[PDB]
């Protein structure tokens, strides 16, 4: 319950870097990757575009381990 994940806050084109424009925190479900992590996934990259409002989950983050 109240586990913030990473939510796309702009549509996030394949094989781009992170930044924090484009990423929110929010209350969805299922729990993708947890609000805390923003940080680290700053210059990371996504494997496949993420449209808006989507939940960042582990395995669209290359890179990406907790």
Same mark, same amino acid.
């Given at each position: 319950?109240?586990?913030?994940?990473?939510?796309?806050n702009?549509?996030i +084109?394949?094989?781009?870097?992170?930044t %924090? /424009?484009?990423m929110?925190?929010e209350v969805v479900? !299922?729990? &993708?990757? +947890?609000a805390?992590?923003?940080?680290? %996934? /700053?210059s990371?990259q996504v494997?496949?575009?993420? !449209?808006? &409002?989507?939940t960042?989950m582990?395995?669209m983050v290359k890179?990406?381990?907790?």
């Open positions: 319950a109240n586990q913030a994940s990473v939510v796309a702009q549509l +084109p394949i094989n781009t870097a992170l %924090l /424009v484009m929110r925190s479900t !299922p729990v &993708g990757i +947890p805390k992590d923003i940080p680290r %996934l /700053v990371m494997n496949r575009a993420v !449209p808006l &409002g989507t960042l582990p395995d890179g990406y381990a907790a």
